[PDB]
Amino acid sequence: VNSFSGYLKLTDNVYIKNADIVEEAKKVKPTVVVNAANVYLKHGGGVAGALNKATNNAMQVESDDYIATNGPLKVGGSCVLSGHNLAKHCLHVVGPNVNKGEDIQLLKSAYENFNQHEVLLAPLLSAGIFGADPIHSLRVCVDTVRTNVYLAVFDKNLYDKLVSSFL
Numbered sequence: 001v002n003s004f005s006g007y008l009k010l011t012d013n014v015y016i017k018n019a020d021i022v023e024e025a026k027k028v029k030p031t032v033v034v035n036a037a038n039v040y041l042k043h044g045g046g047v048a049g050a051l052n053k054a055t056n057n058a059m060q061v062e063s064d065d066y067i068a069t070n071g072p073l074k075v076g077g078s079c080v081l082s083g084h085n086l087a088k089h090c091l092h093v094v095g096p097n098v099n100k101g102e103d104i105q106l107l108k109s110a111y112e113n114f115n116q117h118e119v120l121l122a123p124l125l126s127a128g129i130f131g132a133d134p135i136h137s138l139r140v141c142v143d144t145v146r147t148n149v150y151l152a153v154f155d156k157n158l159y160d161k162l163v164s165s166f167l
């Protein structure tokens, strides 16, 4: 048993809810919150900008030190950093950004990072401002992640659309 509440069960291991991941993180304080990162860990907008804002920019300060030491991530890759005031850990995962011209096949590789963690609170990778089809992102998630994932969908109208179209 875990502390996630009000989720719609999609499969054995995938759950979904219409919620802001920042508000869910603050309430649950999960072991792992996933950030929809870019390779530079520059948290300007979307999930990244909102989580970073909720950490009072501490996420960005930590991220800049990580990049100065290690260089950029790969598209499809990830790193584990602090969850600050939101979670124990933040798993920064880079899905492909369609609005930059990256290969959507890399979305499966991005979701594979979730399998290194038994339970995660996570967003739909590559959706929203990343430019991919969210119905597709949900399908790849269900077909790739084997650990227990609690998906927070921010957009109310998109949430209704994802549930009603789910196979």
Ligand SMILES: Nc1ncnc2[nH]c3cc(F)ccc3c12
Residues within 6 Å of the ligand: 019, 020, 021, 022, 045, 046, 047, 049, 050, 123, 124, 128, 152, 153, 154
């Ligand atoms: N794309 C998302 N998925 C789940 N939760 C979210 N909270 C947000 C807050 C923002 F300002 C922007 C995007 C999200 C978001």
